[PDB]
């Protein structure tokens, strides 16, 4: 019994989190009412990692829904699986955060954070042995970004020895809501560098390009992008939700993936990604080629621009584990110039027999690559283009922030970029 507490904050965080529970509920045989209707014991083997067991054999997700406005969470509660969430785990305000990191972190968010922590504390007190926490949120808004990183800071204060994990959606001008997203992202990235153990970087531009160029979606919607995030979140957590000895728990995954405490930002990937030739069987060589192809990754970073510190691959479905090892060893041995040579055997592979819904087999990719610095470089450049003219700063100073805090967030991320650069050489 190694329980994980799930938190989803803000519009993006709640919309992506909703789909996440919708996907894994289907995999574990949990219906919208919390009743189990699967046909395999593997589904319930590690079911208590994400679900609490209530009276009558009901399974309730260990999820906490947080937002500063009610709109998005009303939709979740009215959504497909909306009734499966614990009613008391909806914690929301009415003011909103106005896409403002300061409102989520210092003013509006501060007024609501204590009530969220009461729910977190309640979920933790019922855990036989809490592994840690995972948070879904975007970095470009106000609630998930500002109040999300506030929650992380206070969770770490109350549970300093638990693992903190996040799925963080990075903003992109191509899929943008407001011009202040680089401000909110730079402020959050510093908080993540300090107070998370693992952050899966999800770039909305990568998700967009995949929907447009690969999936052949003429006009991608947030829903389409979230389908990619759902499928990816299910892949990276397969190790935690089913029987296995590789990256079995959050701390063991961190120990194998994070060689330096600040370089804990991962590029995820998923395969296949087929446009609707969708019934064609996919071979192991094809799964591996795509899984390592940049076009299949969601950080919008070219891996051939940096080097992999560590890699974790997860293959799902009934397949030749012998042929898995062969193709994985083929990728490393045919491109070993992109893997640092001072971390021996830094590519780990894991197999799982249960494939995702509607797929004979799939592969999820988790890479700790120095190429991720390109993502922070983009954000830093957009930040400085506005900050050099102090554009849009009044939204933040009006909430009590000072310009010095922006300068420090700027330096902190440029330091992070420099730290990646030294390990790429």
């Amino acid at each position: 019994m190694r329980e994980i507490v799930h938190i989803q904050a803000g519009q993006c965080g709640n919309q992506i989190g909703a789909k996440f529970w919708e996907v894994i509920s289907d995999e574990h045989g949990i219906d919208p009412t919390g009743s189990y209707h699967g046909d395999s014991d593997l589904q319930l083997e590690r079911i208590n990692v994400y679900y609490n067991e209530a009276t009558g054999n009901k399974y309730v997700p260990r999820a906490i829904l947080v937002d500063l406005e009610p709109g998005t969470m009303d939709s979740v509660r009215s959504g497909p699986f909306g009734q499966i969430f614990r009613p008391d785990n909806f914690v929301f305000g009415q003011s909103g955060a106005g896409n403002n990191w300061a409102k989520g972190h210092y003013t509006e968010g501060a007024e609501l954070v204590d009530s969220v922590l009461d729910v977190v504390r309640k979920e933790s007190e019922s855990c036989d042995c809490l592994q840690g926490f995972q948070l879904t949120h975007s970095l470009g808004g106000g609630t998930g970004s500002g109040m999300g990183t506030l929650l992380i800071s206070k969770i770490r204060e109350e549970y300093p020895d638990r693992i903190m994990n996040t799925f963080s959606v990075m903003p992109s001008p191509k899929v943008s809501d407001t011009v202040v997203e680089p401000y909110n992202a730079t402020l959050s990235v510093h908080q993540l560098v300090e107070n998370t153990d693992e952050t899966y970087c999800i770039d909305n531009e990568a998700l967009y390009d995949i929907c447009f160029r690969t999936l052949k979606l003429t006009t991608p919607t947030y829903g389409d992008l979230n389908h990619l995030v759902s499928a990816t979140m299910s892949g990276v957590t397969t190790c935690l939700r089913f029987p296995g000895q590789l990256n079995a728990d959050l701390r063991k995954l961190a120990v194998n993936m994070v060689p330096f405490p600040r370089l804990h930002f991962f590029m995820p990937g998923f395969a296949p990604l087929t446009s609707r030739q969708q019934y064609r069987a996919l071979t192991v060589p094809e799964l591996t080629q795509q899984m390592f192809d940049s076009k299949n990754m969601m950080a919008a970073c070219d891996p051939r621009h940096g080097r992999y510190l560590t890699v974790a691959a997860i293959f799902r479905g009934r397949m030749s584990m012998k042929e898995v090892d062969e193709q994985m060893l083929n990728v490393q041995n045919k491109n070993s110039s992109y893997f640092v040579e001072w971390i021996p055997n830094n590519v780990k592979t894991a197999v799982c027999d249960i494939p995702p819904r509607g797929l004979k087999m799939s592969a999820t990719f988790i890479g700790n690559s120095t190429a991720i610095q390109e993502l922070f470089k983009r954000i830093s450049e957009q930040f400085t283009a506005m900050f050099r003219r102090k554009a849009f700063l009044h939204w933040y100073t009006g909430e009590g922030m000072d310009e010095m805090e922006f300068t420090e967030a700027e330096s902190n991320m440029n330091d992070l970029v420099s730290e990646y650069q030294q390990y790429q050489d």
């Binding site: 800071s153 770490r156 204060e157 300093p160 020895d161």
Partner: protein, 54 residues
């Protein structure tokens, strides 16, 4: 090629063949090591809480 020390019993036998002749920390010190590492963990956590208190 000599056989020596032949011992036989109901369940087996053993012998030696020669081809050629030839030519701590106390309980106290263990506790200090453990407690010293525990102290370094407490100090590091105190600095973390102090950082969070700021």
């Amino acid at each position: 090629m000599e056989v020596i020390e032949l011992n036989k019993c109901t369940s087996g036998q053993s012998f030696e063949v020669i081809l050629k002749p030839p030519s701590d920390p106390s309980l106290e010190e263990i506790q200090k090591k453990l407690e010293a590492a525990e102290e370094r963990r407490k100090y590091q956590e105190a600095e973390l809480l102090k950082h969070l208190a700021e």
